[PDB]
């Protein structure tokens, strides 16, 4: 039936479990070792060209990227209205925030991460200073963005229901979080927009999709091959 | 009534237009020059704080992201189905490409514009060999990427008829050639692609929404003014 691969140390892959186990949707979990290299594979090059996660199998259907999955979703399991809105301009806010975050947060939350922690702990390999204050400086803009544009006085992103974008919006900055970054510290507007989505969410489903990042600090240092391997793929990942 | 804010140098403003055009879409055409820095004016921001193009303003409705305002055409005005597929795979299909792009294709695509002519020519700054081979080299990637990923042998990057997908792809690719790239020289399946787009689309109409790119290479010199205004933005732009 559906294949669902995914890794839940990233972030597409987490809103896509998520949002599948929040609408009881079957799917077949595939979990593809990111820190092992397991997307890397020709097993997984078989499945995804690309050599990417998340990915979706349905029969002979394949498809990635998580704003087209979770779209793909939504229209096929005829999930509730209130992920993706019928009134035209709620459903234009939902696409627009979900255009507007791969190029900003996503770019900002995983630089984060990376810059942080992943580079100088997993991969042995120190991070300038200069490189992570213009990398923390990034993320507070795109927090401020987040906040000014989208959730503004709401109490969601793009009205007083969770939508999708939230959901995206919200593993997004997750990854800041498990690299010890002051995310919701000082944003009281952020901080109680999340205990709204968690809740929306199911907080044990959202606890139990975050596991992996929130550890992510304390995976072993790869060995030299896996540190090969895993370079060109993170290096790509942040630009 | 419906209002859109464009500059045909810019690659998402094309694709919009050009949708509109070929639609009949009644609208105001609002143009804001980026060369003259009209998108960092107070006036601009008024209309989108976020001072990119294009923006849409339809009443007390804004909107951003060309991605999204494409969706909103699209169904406010009922267009044809063509564009933005009823059967789930193959919209599926035009949301991927739509999501992959941004970081991909779109960036491949501005990088080489402003490494090979914008910077040298419009605004007075060497580029050094290095990097310019180095984006150059990235652009060829991301245009095997195009091939092997969405054209395959296809009519169209979706399927057998043209989308949203296609358009987008175009008017990204039109950078690189304005640039005086080799982007559909040694590239026939691209190149026949091209000549499909281009009838689908109606030719006058593309030749009219590429008329600023084709003629970036004659741009004036910025004036210092200008280039202090401008310069912040076309860092953060390429990055």
Partial sequence: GLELYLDLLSQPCRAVYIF??????????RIVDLIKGQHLSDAFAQV?????????????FTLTESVA??????????????WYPQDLQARA?????????????????????????????????????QTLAATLAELDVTLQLLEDKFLQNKAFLT???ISL????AITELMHPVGAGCQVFEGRPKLATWRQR?????????FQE??????????????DPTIKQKLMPWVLAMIR
């Fill in 197 to 205: 989505v968690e809740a929306a969410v199911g907080e044990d489903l």
């Fill in 48 to 60: 995804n060209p690309l050599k990417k996660v998340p990915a979706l199998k349905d029969g002979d």
């Fill in 93 to 129: 806010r939902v696409d627009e925030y979900l255009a507007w975050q791969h190029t900003t947060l996503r770019r900002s939350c995983l630089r984060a991460l990376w810059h942080k922690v992943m580079f100088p702990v997993f991969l042995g390999e120190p991070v300038s200073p």
């Fill in 165 to 168: 974008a939230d959901l995206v």
């Fill in 69 to 82: 999955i979770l779209l793909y979703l939504t229209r096929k399991y005829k999930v509730p209205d209130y």
């Fill in 209 to 222: 999709a975050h596991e992996v990042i929130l550890k992510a600090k304390d995976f072993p240092p790869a």
């Fill in 159 to 161: 009205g007083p229901h």
């Fill in 20 to 29: 599948a186990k929040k609408n009881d949707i079957p799917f077949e979990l």
